[PDB]
A = this chain, B = another copy of it.
Amino acid sequence: KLPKILIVEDDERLARLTQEYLIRNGLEVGVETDGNRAIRRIISEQPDLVVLDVMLPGADGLTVCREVRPHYHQPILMLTARTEDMDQVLGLEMGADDYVAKPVQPRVLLARIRALLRR
């Protein structure tokens, strides 16, 4: 019974490299590349945590966060190249539990996932 992680990320290669790392570290990990699909997928599959980019086709990650929250109470970790102070504050106030600038070192991302899961 491993924790289930959904990575929502438009860069398919980045998403997959991140997925492989996290799988090697005791997690069950899926990848979604589109924001509208992510909304449906997060709600139906109910992952234990979402790793979410703000920059997504279909629906941006802030919209994903907004739409998903009334039906999804689990941790959302925003992981993005949108690193401005304004962007960070918006993500967190929109309902994200953490907000991490790309690029992130895999070991750090793992530590953050773990910390969020014990919440």
| Contact flags A64-107 to B (C-beta < 8 A → 1, else 0) | 00000000000000000000010011001100111000000101
State the number of copies, please. 2
Query: Is A98 within 8 A of B85, CB to CB?
Result: no
Residue total for A at the interface (Cβ-Cβ under 8 A): 17
Among listed A6-14, A43-51, A54-62, A109-117, interface-contacting one? A109-117
Query: Is A98 within 8 A of B119, CB to CB?
Result: no
Interface check A108, CB cutoff 8 A: yes
Query: Is A85 within 8 A of B107, CB to CB?
Result: yes
User: In the assembled complex, which residues on chain B have CB atoms less than 8 Å from the CB atom of A112?
Assistant: 92
Q: List chain A positions with a Cβ less than 8 A from chain B.
A: 85, 88-89, 92-93, 96-98, 105, 107-108, 111-112, 114-115, 118-119
Inter-chain pairs besides A85-B108, A98-B115, 10 sampled, C-beta below 8 Å? A85-B105, A85-B107, A88-B108, A89-B108, A92-B111, A92-B114, A92-B115, A96-B115, A98-B98, A119-B119
